[PDB]
Amino acid sequence: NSTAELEELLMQRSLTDPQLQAAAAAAADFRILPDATVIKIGGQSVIDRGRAAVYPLVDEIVAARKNHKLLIGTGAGTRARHLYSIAAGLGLPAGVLAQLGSSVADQNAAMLGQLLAKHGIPVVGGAGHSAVPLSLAEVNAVVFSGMPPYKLWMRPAAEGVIPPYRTDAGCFLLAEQFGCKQMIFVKDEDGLYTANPKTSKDATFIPRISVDEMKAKGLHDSILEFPVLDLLQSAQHVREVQVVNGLVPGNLTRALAGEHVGTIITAS
Amino acid sequence: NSTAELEELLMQRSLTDPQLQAAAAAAADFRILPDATVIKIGGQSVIDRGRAAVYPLVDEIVAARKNHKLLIGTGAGTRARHLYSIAAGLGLPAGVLAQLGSSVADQNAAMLGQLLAKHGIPVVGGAGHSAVPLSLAEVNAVVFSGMPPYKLWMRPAAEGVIPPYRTDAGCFLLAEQFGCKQMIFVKDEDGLYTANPKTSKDATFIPRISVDEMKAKGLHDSILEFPVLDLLQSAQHVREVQVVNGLVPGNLTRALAGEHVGTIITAS
Amino acid sequence: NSTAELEELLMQRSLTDPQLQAAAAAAADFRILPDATVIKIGGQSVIDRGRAAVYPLVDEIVAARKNHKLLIGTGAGTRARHLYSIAAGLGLPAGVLAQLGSSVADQNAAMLGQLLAKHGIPVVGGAGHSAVPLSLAEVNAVVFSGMPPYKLWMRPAAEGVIPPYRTDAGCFLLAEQFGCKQMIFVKDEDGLYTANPKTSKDATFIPRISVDEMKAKGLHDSILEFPVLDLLQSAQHVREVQVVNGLVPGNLTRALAGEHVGTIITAS
Amino acid sequence: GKRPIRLLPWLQVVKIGGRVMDRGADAILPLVEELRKLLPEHRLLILTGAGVRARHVFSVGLDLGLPVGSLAPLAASEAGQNGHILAAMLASEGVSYVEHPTVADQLAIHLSATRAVVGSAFPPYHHHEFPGSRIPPHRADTGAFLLADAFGAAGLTIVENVDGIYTADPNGPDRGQARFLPETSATDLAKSEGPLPVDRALLDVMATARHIERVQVVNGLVPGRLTAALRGEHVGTLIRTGVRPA
Amino acid sequence: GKRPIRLLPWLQVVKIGGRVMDRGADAILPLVEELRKLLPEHRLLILTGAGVRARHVFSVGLDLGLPVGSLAPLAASEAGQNGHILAAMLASEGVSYVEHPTVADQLAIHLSATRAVVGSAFPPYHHHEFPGSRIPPHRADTGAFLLADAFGAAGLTIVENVDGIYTADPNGPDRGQARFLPETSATDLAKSEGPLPVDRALLDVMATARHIERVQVVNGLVPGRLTAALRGEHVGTLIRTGVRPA
Amino acid sequence: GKRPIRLLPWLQVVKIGGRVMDRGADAILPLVEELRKLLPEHRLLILTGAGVRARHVFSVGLDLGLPVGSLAPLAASEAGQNGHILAAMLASEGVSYVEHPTVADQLAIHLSATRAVVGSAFPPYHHHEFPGSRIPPHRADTGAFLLADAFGAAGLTIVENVDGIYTADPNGPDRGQARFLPETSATDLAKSEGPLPVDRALLDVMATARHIERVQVVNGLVPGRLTAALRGEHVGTLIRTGVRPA
Ligand SMILES: Nc1ncnc2c1ncn2[C@@H]1O[C@H](COP(=O)(O)OP(=O)(O)OP(=O)(O)O)[C@@H](O)[C@H]1O
Ligand SMILES: Nc1ncnc2c1ncn2[C@@H]1O[C@H](COP(=O)(O)OP(=O)(O)OP(=O)(O)O)[C@@H](O)[C@H]1O
Ligand SMILES: Nc1ncnc2c1ncn2[C@@H]1O[C@H](COP(=O)(O)OP(=O)(O)OP(=O)(O)O)[C@@H](O)[C@H]1O
Ligand SMILES: Nc1ncnc2c1ncn2[C@@H]1O[C@H](COP(=O)(O)OP(=O)(O)OP(=O)(O)O)[C@@H](O)[C@H]1O
Ligand SMILES: Nc1ncnc2c1ncn2[C@@H]1O[C@H](COP(=O)(O)OP(=O)(O)OP(=O)(O)O)[C@@H](O)[C@H]1O
Ligand SMILES: Nc1ncnc2c1ncn2[C@@H]1O[C@H](COP(=O)(O)OP(=O)(O)OP(=O)(O)O)[C@@H](O)[C@H]1O
Ligand SMILES: [Cl-]
Ligand SMILES: [Cl-]
Ligand SMILES: [Cl-]
Ligand SMILES: [Mg+2]
Ligand SMILES: [Mg+2]
Ligand SMILES: [Mg+2]
């Protein structure tokens, strides 16, 4: 379908028209930041734990940016869960909770950024303004808060008022829409298990699994926000993700070097 | 006239006083960004044409910034003309149309900037914050929207509600007030002709001409917003401009190298 | 006191509890920008004097940033005193005057920044976003306005409506809270004297003095905002300051090189 | 437990299609006069869609290969410009355009200050838009509904350039087979394939709605239908969301 | 000469403790109902404190070694979230949350638009917080008073989770020795050592106050006490600031 | 066709000279009292000029060699500070200072919320100021007129520290030859050389005006003249713009 056929459809049809949708699908595919890696630093799993968890990861970030462009997003953690509990008890809707949780991820980005400032790494709003930092060997990394911007327009879950799209989904969608080469989630477990390893004695480690396989095992909502798995299956650019343990020294460095630590989750 | 005479006048007279005006005219002249070049990328003439026009110019920008500091402003184009038509049909004044047109130049700056982000080149508000980008060999260029900030305070034309000061004037005044060394307008024609080359069979190319000569030929409003020619005659720093064809491969690169492609319009 | 004892106190006690205060005092001490120097450029003493004072200091800043990370804050000066006089005559409170004075320090930061833009040095809001500039040899410095952000929440003085915390205090608190290594106040006198050298014939120069010694001599409010001396005695990171004459060529360069020009004021 | 509270239960939300605005003064002036007469009757949040200019920026953006997250904020700009145009025509009545963060956090105080405000119907998904289609999914209809339902508003009325939803595009190739649908459910529409005058994502967010029980699509080119729809009169297509009433 | 003029002499300022908000619906819903009934009686600036979430971010921040200027804006965020929660519950009455710069420069127009606004009680000291303690000094009580006195407001009432000030922490280890103080001076409190339910910095800014003569601390968990305090009735602890009346 | 519509036809715009504000309480307090009594009579946009502090920043800026585009925003800051001072004195009446983007896009809702707002008369030309003179051309008088005419306001009144326009500076060297001009045209003034109490650029924008037919310059140091001018009474210099009435 030529550009001419696409423009005619774009002008004459509703965007809902399947013929228009199909013509747009044939458009060229440009990756905005193809050589960058998006990293999510867990709020509850990492930053909430303080210096014992955060200081080693600061060292890894400083070492890794010598050879890797990094987009580092922060989670929210226990203070967001407290806000969610207060607001949910008041009957407030998901859109209001979404705004509250964003403030907590901002706090964590500020604390992490202040530990990195002397290394030249700034705190930015998001990947939209990472162009100059990522082009400088002196910096080559940025920190941002991982919450998506939906705010009051957050789509609610089928049940309950907890926002379904939180910092895992925010960071993933940033990797996807900027066409980044890699998405790494930094948590407090080695990876995916057959059961929650914190509340199960004999869970088995899973090095590699597809989204479909996860759902068939009953793991749709385990170590990642389960909306992320659905977004992953729809993604154009980021078709797999890696989940690693930020509490193991060097795990992030080794993941960036191509070592298969943790669990690789594939769209297909 | 000493600084003392100027300060006495500044304190005792109205700013309208010719004696005060003349004393201020004798002040020193500081150029803020003397080694930068301002480039306007046409909206209708270039960006509206899509990849066939834009992709080659992205390549030229990336190649040119290795040796030239660049301030790259974007035009608006057909979407602004649609907005102008809607608003003019409603009887809205020039100041309101001015605000509408700014949004379109912002769109074009965003699209061009996203193609340049992986090369380290940011999208900024304007030249006011280009200091660090322009000092880095890795970047050495910025993209901004070319519309002036007048908004509702836009001075209207003598006739009609179309804002007279659009992206040509915005980019020129930026070059002038930052004391840049060169102003290049990138359009879709080789330069100025004796008549509109799109709607005239036998127009003749004009390599070099003064503002006065243009007016005497009836070309006051041809390839540039005609207010720009008047601003050019009043300019302190940028006393000539160059108009080149962005659709000819390498034309921008060759203009930056000092080759006299296109048309040079001089204030005198 | 372990982290566990601190967290229990933080959850169970009022922040006013002396036991909680003492436990927090034992926390680790992180310096955010330990290798940077904060410099205050006086408004009335320097910038208000024009090119004869400002141009030589621009040269020193450009030369000094080759070897020193610089956080350069601007004072306000005579235009702020005019605003203070107008507003005080109207009975407006200190909080309102504080907002007015901030605009003047912003003006001075803009003028100084425009003289430095071609050298790659940006004007920023404050030290919070100086990470990337300070990591680049091409830049290695930023300019900001020195007024604190208290605005309407300014604590008033015991007598009168003049805001007690102005650009000296703003710059000092920035040096203190980012853990910078050095704080230099650039004024229009060689340093501290036994009396105001402008209005006293036989004042004696003081090369080094403590805050306590200053108060005992009746110099609590002389060459620095007297609240600064009290803040200096409470500081964790910046326990002395240096006051130098910006009108003496090279004085700032020599202070940054460790030469004991001017007066060193110590907390103890 | 129970559904969340209604933040602004007295609010009426009206979404104006961008293609209605595209028609210029011929369509806008009658609509502005009808809105003027509605100000004393309702507390109105008026939200504008994007229209044809978003199609053009999609044409350029797709030609440049840009992803869907890049196209979303570009289209949203056009909805905002339509809102500025509409608000300007109502300025003498005390109506102004307000931004997303003001809509999200201060709509209450603004509707205490004046009878109506105008904003953009496009939601702030932008570079965090969902992947899958190269056309941004969460458009003006979807954003207007998300907002109306989050607020617990009294209703959402969609103002179109057609009478409502048909069984085929009433201006398209199969226009001869198009039958008007006075009443339908979001679930029934979602299970259908073919074009609609409303976002397909609208049907998805209707399935998770917590307050809004029905949305009427009415022809803004027929004076009086918006007024009638805001009184609950059936003059267009009624879409049942699946929210059950007390 | 004379003291500065009163900018908003008809204003009543109410500071809601963050630990009151921490109690959730059980405490917030009665407070929201009392505030609803006060809207027609007073022109209210409602300011929220931070509460327990600020203690947690202090725990993490101090563990990371961050200075007091870094902890101040982190705690202020929590006060702002409490304000957004409270404003949402009052949105149907026309109440919205407003930011610091709006509070500082446009409070007049906003209280002309609606009967009450909500904001953060924490002052914008942030990275310019004073050194000395590792716990940020200028907290919610201090910011609320600075604002109220700068405006020349008619009063400031502090809403606590206790009846007022005691001679010891009424929930702490020496709770058995705690005697209730119906009335005290800021100077007398300042010369005392031991915990208080109000910032120690509050006592300092009271010493330089120019208008506010008394501040009452009342139990927000007892319905009606806020209403009584706003009428000058003595239902908690009265703090005399040292400002002398005409 | 026809001239553009009037956006705010019921608006009265008042420009207060910066040199009037420079006189301090002696001039401001009587002006504030007169403005207070005008609030119930008119819907006022009050715009402040820059005054002497802009002359000082011009002195420093020109000594540093800065171009005219750098001096324009520096002078505009001083007009904004004058606006903040004036608004503070009127805060108890519900009046606040509003920024340029609020003036440009939300003036309607703000004048629905309160009877008057204060803003800066300086236009946002800033670094895009026209070259030619080293003194920024588009100053307070010019910005106030551009705004008033763009809005289609009912009038613009300029409040000066002199009775109006003379044939020479009434406080200058040729003050002995200065004859008062009760009435003049912008074109006649433009063809004259010599100082004026209004920007020369004001005369240029009057030539392209679309609504405002006359602007009166009155002495703000004489109580009552502003009140009279807002009722169309001739108490100063009337400037005819060249706009023709129906
Ligand atoms: N099958 C499973 N395998 C591994 N982990 C699991 C599984 N099921 C549940 N989990 C739990 O999921 C948690 C990861 O979610 P968590 O919210 O901690 O991540 P996070 O990034 O810290 O979130 P936030 O950033 O929002 O705080 C782990 O702490 C782990 O205990
Ligand atoms: N005498 C002439 N010589 C050359 N070109 C002329 C002449 N007269 C008219 N033109 C036309 O002027 C046009 C340039 O204006 P145009 O608006 O396209 O520039 P632009 O930078 O794309 O504007 P914008 O950026 O606002 O879209 C050319 O397309 C050309 O057809
Ligand atoms: N004992 C003293 N020794 C030295 N200087 C003194 C003494 N007492 C008073 N001064 C005066 O203090 C002044 C320094 O204060 P000044 O306000 O000029 O600094 P500044 O940084 O320019 O302030 P701002 O930046 O707010 O304009 C000097 O000009 C000096 O005349
Ligand atoms: N099944 C259908 N029923 C009715 N109209 C349809 C149908 N399918 C397609 N259409 C077309 O959709 C058009 C409306 O287009 P669209 O919804 O894109 O405009 P809009 O809602 O004004 O735009 P925006 O979403 O930017 O506000 C109608 O004119 C009609 O031709
Ligand atoms: N002398 C005292 N009198 C009364 N209460 C005290 C005293 N000393 C300590 N407290 C304790 O202080 C508690 C109130 O805590 P705090 O003031 O920190 O909460 P808050 O004011 O809601 O918080 P925020 O300052 O964030 O608004 C009371 O519940 C009480 O246990
Ligand atoms: N022809 C004239 N007629 C009247 N006044 C004149 C004339 N020429 C000069 N002036 C002088 O202009 C002065 C007013 O100055 P100016 O207009 O700069 O102040 P302003 O309007 O308050 O300033 P701003 O433009 O910042 O608001 C008068 O006091 C008068 O001395
Ligand atoms: Cl769709
Ligand atoms: Cl002039
Ligand atoms: Cl304390
Ligand atoms: Mg539609
Ligand atoms: Mg308390
Ligand atoms: Mg004047």
Coordinates of N, CA, C and O in Angstrom, one line a residue, chain B residues 22-66:
Chain B
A22 N 19.6 58.5 21.0 CA 20.9 58.6 20.3 C 22.0 58.2 21.2 O 23.0 57.6 20.8
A23 N 21.9 58.5 22.5 CA 23.0 58.1 23.5 C 23.0 56.6 23.6 O 24.1 56.0 23.7
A24 N 21.9 56.0 23.7 CA 21.9 54.5 23.8 C 22.4 53.9 22.5 O 23.1 52.8 22.6
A25 N 22.2 54.5 21.4 CA 22.8 53.9 20.1 C 24.3 53.8 20.1 O 24.8 53.0 19.3
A26 N 25.0 54.6 20.9 CA 26.4 54.6 21.0 C 27.0 53.5 21.9 O 28.2 53.4 22.0
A27 N 26.1 52.7 22.5 CA 26.6 51.7 23.5 C 27.3 50.6 22.7 O 27.2 50.4 21.5
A28 N 28.2 49.9 23.5 CA 28.9 48.8 22.9 C 28.0 47.7 22.4 O 26.8 47.7 22.8
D29 N 28.5 46.9 21.5 CA 27.7 45.9 20.8 C 28.3 44.5 21.1 O 29.4 44.1 20.7
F30 N 27.5 43.7 21.9 CA 28.0 42.4 22.3 C 27.2 41.3 21.5 O 25.9 41.4 21.5
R31 N 27.9 40.4 20.9 CA 27.2 39.2 20.2 C 27.2 38.0 21.2 O 28.3 37.6 21.7
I32 N 26.1 37.5 21.4 CA 25.9 36.4 22.4 C 26.4 35.1 21.9 O 27.1 34.3 22.6
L33 N 26.0 34.7 20.6 CA 26.4 33.5 20.0 C 27.0 33.8 18.6 O 26.4 33.4 17.6
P34 N 28.2 34.4 18.6 CA 28.7 34.9 17.3 C 29.1 33.9 16.3 O 29.2 34.2 15.1
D35 N 29.4 32.6 16.8 CA 29.8 31.6 15.8 C 28.7 30.6 15.4 O 29.0 29.6 14.8
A36 N 27.5 30.9 15.8 CA 26.4 30.0 15.5 C 25.7 30.4 14.2 O 25.8 31.6 13.8
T37 N 25.1 29.5 13.5 CA 24.3 29.7 12.3 C 22.8 29.3 12.6 O 22.6 28.2 13.1
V38 N 21.9 30.2 12.3 CA 20.5 29.9 12.4 C 20.0 29.4 11.1 O 20.2 30.0 10.0
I39 N 19.3 28.2 11.1 CA 18.7 27.6 9.9 C 17.2 27.4 10.2 O 16.8 26.9 11.2
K40 N 16.4 27.9 9.2 CA 15.0 27.6 9.3 C 14.7 26.5 8.3 O 15.0 26.6 7.1
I41 N 14.0 25.5 8.8 CA 13.6 24.4 7.9 C 12.1 24.6 7.6 O 11.2 24.6 8.6
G42 N 11.8 24.8 6.4 CA 10.4 25.2 6.0 C 9.4 24.1 6.4 O 9.7 22.9 6.3
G43 N 8.2 24.6 6.9 CA 7.2 23.6 7.2 C 6.5 23.1 6.0 O 6.5 21.9 5.7
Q44 N 5.9 24.0 5.2 CA 5.2 23.6 4.0 C 6.2 23.1 2.9 O 5.9 22.1 2.2
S45 N 7.3 23.8 2.8 CA 8.3 23.5 1.7 C 9.1 22.2 2.0 O 9.6 21.6 1.0
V46 N 9.3 21.8 3.3 CA 10.1 20.7 3.6 C 9.4 19.6 4.4 O 9.2 18.5 4.0
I47 N 9.1 20.0 5.7 CA 8.7 19.0 6.6 C 7.4 18.3 6.2 O 7.2 17.1 6.3
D48 N 6.5 19.1 5.7 CA 5.2 18.6 5.2 C 5.4 17.6 4.1 O 4.5 16.8 3.8
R49 N 6.5 17.6 3.4 CA 6.8 16.6 2.3 C 7.2 15.2 2.8 O 7.3 14.3 2.0
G50 N 7.5 15.1 4.1 CA 7.8 13.8 4.6 C 9.2 13.3 4.5 O 10.1 14.1 4.4
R51 N 9.4 12.0 4.4 CA 10.7 11.4 4.5 C 11.6 11.8 3.3 O 12.8 12.0 3.5
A52 N 11.0 11.9 2.1 CA 11.8 12.2 0.9 C 12.6 13.5 1.1 O 13.7 13.6 0.5
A53 N 12.0 14.5 1.8 CA 12.7 15.7 2.0 C 13.4 15.8 3.3 O 14.5 16.3 3.4
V54 N 12.8 15.2 4.4 CA 13.3 15.3 5.7 C 14.6 14.5 6.0 O 15.5 14.9 6.6
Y55 N 14.5 13.2 5.5 CA 15.6 12.3 5.8 C 16.9 12.8 5.3 O 18.0 12.8 6.0
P56 N 17.0 13.2 4.0 CA 18.3 13.8 3.6 C 18.8 15.0 4.4 O 20.0 15.1 4.6
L57 N 17.9 15.8 4.8 CA 18.3 17.0 5.6 C 18.8 16.6 7.0 O 19.7 17.2 7.6
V58 N 18.2 15.6 7.6 CA 18.7 15.0 8.8 C 20.2 14.6 8.7 O 21.0 14.9 9.5
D59 N 20.5 13.9 7.6 CA 21.8 13.5 7.3 C 22.8 14.7 7.2 O 23.9 14.7 7.7
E60 N 22.3 15.8 6.5 CA 23.1 17.0 6.4 C 23.4 17.6 7.7 O 24.5 18.1 8.0
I61 N 22.3 17.7 8.5 CA 22.5 18.3 9.9 C 23.5 17.5 10.7 O 24.4 18.1 11.3
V62 N 23.4 16.2 10.7 CA 24.4 15.4 11.4 C 25.8 15.6 10.9 O 26.7 15.6 11.7
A63 N 25.9 15.7 9.6 CA 27.3 15.9 9.0 C 27.8 17.3 9.3 O 29.0 17.5 9.6
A64 N 26.9 18.3 9.2 CA 27.3 19.7 9.3 C 27.7 20.1 10.7 O 28.6 20.9 10.9
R65 N 27.0 19.5 11.7 CA 27.3 19.9 13.1 C 28.7 19.5 13.5 O 29.2 19.9 14.6
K66 N 29.4 18.6 12.7 CA 30.8 18.3 13.1 C 31.7 19.5 13.0 O 32.7 19.6 13.7

